[PDB]
CSV table of C-alpha atoms and ligand atoms in Angstrom, one decimal:
chain,number,residue,atom,x,y,z
A,24,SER,CA,62.9,-13.9,9.5
A,25,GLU,CA,61.7,-17.1,11.2
A,26,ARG,CA,59.5,-19.1,8.8
A,27,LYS,CA,57.5,-20.8,11.5
A,28,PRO,CA,56.2,-19.7,15.0
A,29,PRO,CA,57.7,-21.2,18.3
A,30,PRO,CA,56.4,-24.7,19.2
A,31,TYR,CA,53.0,-25.1,20.8
A,32,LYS,CA,50.2,-27.7,20.8
A,33,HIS,CA,47.2,-26.7,18.7
A,34,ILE,CA,44.2,-27.8,20.8
A,35,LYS,CA,40.4,-27.4,20.5
A,36,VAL,CA,39.7,-26.6,24.1
A,37,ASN,CA,41.2,-25.2,27.3
A,38,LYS,CA,43.3,-27.6,29.3
A,39,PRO,CA,43.7,-27.4,33.1
A,40,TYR,CA,47.0,-27.5,34.9
A,41,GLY,CA,47.9,-28.1,38.5
A,42,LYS,CA,45.6,-26.9,41.2
A,43,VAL,CA,43.3,-24.6,39.1
A,44,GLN,CA,39.5,-24.9,39.5
A,45,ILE,CA,37.3,-26.3,36.8
A,46,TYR,CA,33.5,-26.1,36.6
A,47,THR,CA,31.1,-28.3,34.6
A,48,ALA,CA,27.3,-28.5,34.2
A,49,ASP,CA,25.0,-31.4,33.5
A,50,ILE,CA,22.6,-30.8,30.6
A,51,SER,CA,19.9,-30.2,33.3
A,52,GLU,CA,21.7,-27.1,34.8
A,53,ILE,CA,22.1,-25.2,31.4
A,54,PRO,CA,19.6,-22.3,30.8
A,55,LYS,CA,16.8,-22.7,28.2
A,56,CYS,CA,15.7,-19.8,26.0
A,57,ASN,CA,12.1,-19.3,24.6
A,58,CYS,CA,13.1,-19.4,20.8
A,59,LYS,CA,11.1,-21.7,18.5
A,60,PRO,CA,12.8,-23.9,15.8
A,61,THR,CA,10.4,-22.2,13.3
A,62,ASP,CA,12.0,-18.7,14.0
A,63,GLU,CA,13.7,-16.6,11.3
A,64,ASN,CA,17.1,-17.2,12.8
A,65,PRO,CA,16.6,-19.1,16.0
A,66,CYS,CA,19.1,-18.1,18.8
A,67,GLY,CA,20.8,-16.1,16.0
A,68,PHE,CA,22.8,-12.9,16.2
A,69,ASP,CA,19.8,-10.7,15.3
A,70,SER,CA,17.4,-12.8,17.4
A,71,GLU,CA,15.7,-12.0,20.7
A,72,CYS,CA,17.3,-15.1,22.4
A,73,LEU,CA,17.3,-15.0,26.2
A,74,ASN,CA,20.5,-17.1,26.3
A,75,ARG,CA,22.3,-15.0,23.7
A,76,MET,CA,21.4,-11.6,25.4
A,77,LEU,CA,22.8,-12.8,28.7
A,78,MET,CA,25.9,-14.3,27.0
A,79,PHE,CA,25.0,-17.9,27.7
A,80,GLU,CA,25.6,-20.6,25.0
A,81,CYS,CA,22.6,-22.9,24.3
A,82,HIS,CA,23.1,-26.6,24.7
A,83,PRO,CA,22.1,-29.0,21.8
A,84,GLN,CA,19.9,-31.3,24.1
A,85,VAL,CA,18.4,-28.3,26.0
A,86,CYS,CA,17.5,-25.7,23.3
A,87,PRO,CA,13.8,-25.6,22.1
A,88,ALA,CA,15.2,-24.6,18.6
A,89,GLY,CA,16.8,-28.1,18.5
A,90,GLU,CA,19.5,-28.3,15.8
A,91,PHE,CA,18.4,-25.0,14.2
A,92,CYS,CA,19.9,-23.2,17.2
A,93,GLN,CA,22.4,-20.6,16.0
A,94,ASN,CA,23.8,-20.0,19.5
A,95,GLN,CA,26.4,-22.8,19.7
A,96,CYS,CA,29.5,-20.9,18.4
A,97,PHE,CA,32.0,-21.9,21.1
A,98,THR,CA,31.1,-25.7,21.2
A,99,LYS,CA,31.0,-26.0,17.4
A,100,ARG,CA,34.2,-23.8,17.1
A,101,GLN,CA,32.5,-21.7,14.4
A,102,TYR,CA,35.4,-19.4,13.6
A,103,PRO,CA,35.8,-17.3,10.4
A,104,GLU,CA,38.6,-18.8,8.4
A,105,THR,CA,41.9,-17.0,9.3
A,106,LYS,CA,45.6,-17.1,8.2
A,107,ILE,CA,48.8,-16.6,10.2
A,108,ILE,CA,50.9,-13.8,8.7
A,109,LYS,CA,54.3,-12.3,9.4
A,110,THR,CA,54.8,-8.6,10.1
A,111,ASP,CA,57.9,-6.4,10.7
A,112,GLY,CA,58.2,-5.6,14.4
A,113,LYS,CA,55.1,-7.4,15.5
A,114,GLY,CA,56.0,-10.9,14.2
A,115,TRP,CA,53.4,-13.5,13.7
A,116,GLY,CA,49.8,-12.3,13.5
A,117,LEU,CA,46.3,-13.4,12.4
A,118,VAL,CA,44.2,-12.1,9.4
A,119,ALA,CA,40.8,-13.5,8.2
A,120,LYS,CA,39.9,-15.0,4.8
A,121,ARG,CA,36.3,-13.5,4.7
A,122,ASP,CA,34.7,-10.2,5.8
A,123,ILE,CA,33.5,-10.2,9.4
A,124,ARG,CA,30.5,-8.1,10.6
A,125,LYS,CA,30.4,-6.0,13.8
A,126,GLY,CA,29.5,-8.2,16.9
A,127,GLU,CA,30.4,-11.5,15.1
A,128,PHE,CA,32.2,-14.4,16.9
A,129,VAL,CA,35.8,-14.5,15.6
A,130,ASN,CA,37.5,-17.1,17.9
A,131,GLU,CA,37.8,-18.6,21.4
A,132,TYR,CA,40.9,-17.7,23.4
A,133,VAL,CA,42.0,-21.2,24.4
A,134,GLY,CA,45.1,-22.5,26.3
A,135,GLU,CA,46.5,-24.1,29.4
A,136,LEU,CA,44.3,-23.2,32.4
A,137,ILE,CA,46.4,-22.1,35.4
A,138,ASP,CA,45.9,-20.5,38.8
A,139,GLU,CA,47.4,-17.1,39.9
A,140,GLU,CA,50.4,-18.6,41.9
A,141,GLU,CA,51.3,-20.7,38.8
A,142,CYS,CA,50.9,-17.7,36.4
A,143,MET,CA,53.1,-15.4,38.6
A,144,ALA,CA,55.8,-18.2,38.7
A,145,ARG,CA,55.8,-18.5,34.9
A,146,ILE,CA,56.1,-14.7,34.4
A,147,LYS,CA,58.9,-14.5,37.0
A,148,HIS,CA,60.8,-17.3,35.2
A,149,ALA,CA,60.1,-15.7,31.8
A,150,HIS,CA,61.4,-12.2,32.9
A,151,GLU,CA,64.6,-13.8,34.3
A,152,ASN,CA,65.3,-16.0,31.3
A,153,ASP,CA,64.2,-13.1,29.0
A,154,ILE,CA,61.4,-15.1,27.4
A,155,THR,CA,58.5,-13.2,25.6
A,156,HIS,CA,55.9,-15.5,27.1
A,157,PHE,CA,52.8,-13.3,27.5
A,158,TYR,CA,50.2,-15.8,26.3
A,159,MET,CA,48.5,-15.3,29.6
A,160,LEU,CA,44.9,-14.0,29.7
A,161,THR,CA,42.9,-13.7,33.0
A,162,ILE,CA,39.5,-15.4,33.2
A,163,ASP,CA,38.8,-14.3,36.8
A,164,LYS,CA,40.9,-14.2,40.0
A,165,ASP,CA,43.0,-17.4,40.3
A,166,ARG,CA,42.0,-18.7,36.7
A,167,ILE,CA,44.4,-17.6,33.9
A,168,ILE,CA,44.5,-19.1,30.3
A,169,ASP,CA,48.1,-19.7,29.2
A,170,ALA,CA,48.0,-20.2,25.4
A,171,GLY,CA,51.9,-20.4,25.3
A,172,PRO,CA,52.4,-24.2,25.5
A,173,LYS,CA,49.0,-25.1,24.0
A,174,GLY,CA,46.2,-23.1,22.4
A,175,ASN,CA,44.5,-22.4,19.1
A,176,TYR,CA,44.9,-19.7,16.4
A,177,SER,CA,43.8,-16.9,18.8
A,178,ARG,CA,47.3,-16.9,20.3
A,179,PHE,CA,48.5,-15.3,17.0
A,180,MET,CA,46.3,-12.2,17.5
A,181,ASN,CA,48.3,-9.1,18.2
A,182,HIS,CA,47.6,-6.2,20.6
A,183,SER,CA,46.2,-3.0,19.1
A,184,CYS,CA,45.5,0.3,20.8
A,185,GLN,CA,42.7,0.6,18.2
A,186,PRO,CA,41.5,-3.0,18.2
A,187,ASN,CA,38.9,-4.5,15.9
A,188,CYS,CA,38.1,-7.4,18.3
A,189,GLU,CA,37.4,-7.6,22.1
A,190,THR,CA,37.2,-10.4,24.6
A,191,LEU,CA,33.8,-11.3,26.2
A,192,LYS,CA,33.3,-13.9,29.0
A,193,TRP,CA,30.5,-16.4,28.2
A,194,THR,CA,29.0,-19.2,30.2
A,195,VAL,CA,29.3,-22.5,28.3
A,196,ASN,CA,28.5,-25.9,29.8
A,197,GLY,CA,28.8,-24.8,33.4
A,198,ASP,CA,32.1,-22.8,33.1
A,199,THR,CA,33.5,-19.4,31.9
A,200,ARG,CA,34.9,-19.2,28.4
A,201,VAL,CA,36.7,-16.3,26.7
A,202,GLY,CA,35.4,-15.4,23.3
A,203,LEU,CA,36.9,-12.9,20.8
A,204,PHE,CA,34.2,-10.8,19.1
A,205,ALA,CA,34.4,-8.1,16.4
A,206,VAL,CA,33.9,-4.5,17.6
A,207,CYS,CA,33.4,-3.2,14.0
A,208,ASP,CA,33.0,-4.6,10.5
A,209,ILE,CA,36.3,-6.3,9.5
A,210,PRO,CA,37.2,-6.6,5.7
A,211,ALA,CA,38.9,-9.9,4.7
A,212,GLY,CA,42.7,-9.7,4.9
A,213,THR,CA,42.7,-7.3,7.8
A,214,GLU,CA,44.8,-8.2,10.9
A,215,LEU,CA,42.6,-9.3,13.9
A,216,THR,CA,43.7,-7.6,17.1
A,217,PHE,CA,42.5,-7.1,20.7
A,218,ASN,CA,43.4,-5.0,23.7
A,219,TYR,CA,45.6,-6.9,26.2
A,220,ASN,CA,44.8,-5.3,29.6
A,221,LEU,CA,44.5,-8.4,31.6
A,222,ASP,CA,48.0,-8.6,33.2
A,223,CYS,CA,50.8,-6.6,34.8
A,224,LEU,CA,53.0,-3.9,33.1
A,225,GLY,CA,55.9,-6.3,32.7
A,226,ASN,CA,57.2,-4.4,29.6
A,227,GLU,CA,61.0,-4.7,30.0
A,228,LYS,CA,62.1,-5.0,26.3
A,229,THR,CA,58.6,-5.0,24.9
A,230,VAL,CA,57.0,-1.8,23.4
A,231,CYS,CA,53.7,-0.9,21.8
A,232,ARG,CA,54.1,-1.5,18.1
A,233,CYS,CA,50.4,-1.3,17.2
A,234,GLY,CA,50.9,1.8,15.1
A,235,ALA,CA,47.5,3.3,16.1
A,236,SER,CA,47.3,7.2,16.2
A,237,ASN,CA,46.3,7.0,19.9
A,238,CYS,CA,49.2,4.6,20.9
A,239,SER,CA,50.2,5.2,24.6
A,240,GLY,CA,53.5,3.3,24.0
A,241,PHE,CA,53.2,0.2,26.2
A,242,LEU,CA,51.2,-3.0,26.3
A,243,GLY,CA,50.3,-3.2,30.0
B,16,LIG,N1,50.9,-4.4,20.3
B,16,LIG,C1,52.0,-5.1,20.3
B,16,LIG,N2,53.2,-4.4,20.3
B,16,LIG,C2,54.4,-5.2,20.3
B,16,LIG,N3,54.3,-6.6,20.2
B,16,LIG,C3,53.1,-7.2,20.2
B,16,LIG,C4,52.0,-6.4,20.3
B,16,LIG,N4,50.9,-7.2,20.4
B,16,LIG,C5,51.4,-8.5,20.4
B,16,LIG,N5,52.7,-8.4,20.3
B,16,LIG,C6,53.6,-9.6,20.3
B,16,LIG,C7,53.5,-10.3,21.5
B,16,LIG,C8,53.6,-9.6,22.7
B,16,LIG,C9,53.1,-10.1,23.9
B,16,LIG,C10,53.0,-9.3,25.0
B,16,LIG,C11,54.1,-8.8,25.6
B,16,LIG,C12,53.9,-7.9,26.7
B,16,LIG,C13,52.6,-7.6,27.1
B,16,LIG,F1,52.5,-6.8,28.2
B,16,LIG,C14,51.5,-8.2,26.5
B,16,LIG,F2,50.3,-7.9,27.0
B,16,LIG,C15,51.7,-9.0,25.5
B,16,LIG,N6,52.7,-11.4,23.9
B,16,LIG,C16,52.7,-12.2,22.7
B,16,LIG,C17,53.1,-11.6,21.5
B,16,LIG,N7,53.0,-12.3,20.4
B,16,LIG,C18,51.7,-12.9,20.0
B,16,LIG,C19,51.6,-13.0,18.5
B,16,LIG,C20,52.8,-13.7,17.9
B,16,LIG,C21,54.0,-13.0,18.3
B,16,LIG,N8,54.0,-11.6,17.7
B,16,LIG,C22,55.1,-13.6,17.7
B,16,LIG,C23,55.7,-14.7,18.3
B,16,LIG,C24,56.8,-15.3,17.8
B,16,LIG,C25,57.4,-14.8,16.7
B,16,LIG,C26,56.8,-13.7,16.1
B,16,LIG,N9,55.7,-13.1,16.6
B,16,LIG,C27,54.2,-12.9,19.8
B,17,ZN,ZN1,17.3,-18.8,21.8
B,18,ZN,ZN1,19.4,-22.0,21.2
B,19,ZN,ZN1,50.1,1.2,20.9
């Protein structure tokens, strides 16, 4: 029983490393929806927002709804309150403090941004030194988020063969960002989990301890 998780820097945004590619957009390049600020829930989850439908985040200076824009989840870091918990064979995990509804933004998978060469080198080093460092999540080819050295609470989310959350790739301020969203209603106090199918089957000493009835037995 370790009382505290391994060291890492709690950040609020992805941090690039080495020769990885980063993209940005000036306020002028960000898409503009046709929501009004007088709408029931402008750019909201139940709204007909053009930007929301296409998984584009509105910018504060660009949106016609102004400050009443409800499509700024990633930038404002609008996460349901969560708590890190300790399980048996799964170790540290994440549960939420309030009920979460289906489709709702849960968190952003944040970390050190690395290219594929760098990721492969880290995994090879981990496998040789027997380190359980699988905080790597692919954005696209040659861009991988490594939440091992630095990340936010999303790194505490465990893998589940029957997950209650899923990753969705959104465009925010000119670049791709990985959001965690609920696939069903989640009662407060339930462990937040997602399906980790973004890497290789490097399951040497690791085994699927999700507990789901459809468990295939591995993580890759
Ligand atoms: N479904 C799981 N079955 C067994 N172990 C799991 C499962 N899902 C996540 N973990 C743990 C784990 C495995 C992999 C992993 C391994 C192989 C893979 F193929 C893969 F996709 C992921 N990367 C990270 C973790 N964590 C994340 C949460 C905190 C953690 N539990 C922890 C850390 C320190 C102390 C206690 N606990 C370690
Ligand atoms: Zn809108
Ligand atoms: Zn908006
Ligand atoms: Zn399983």
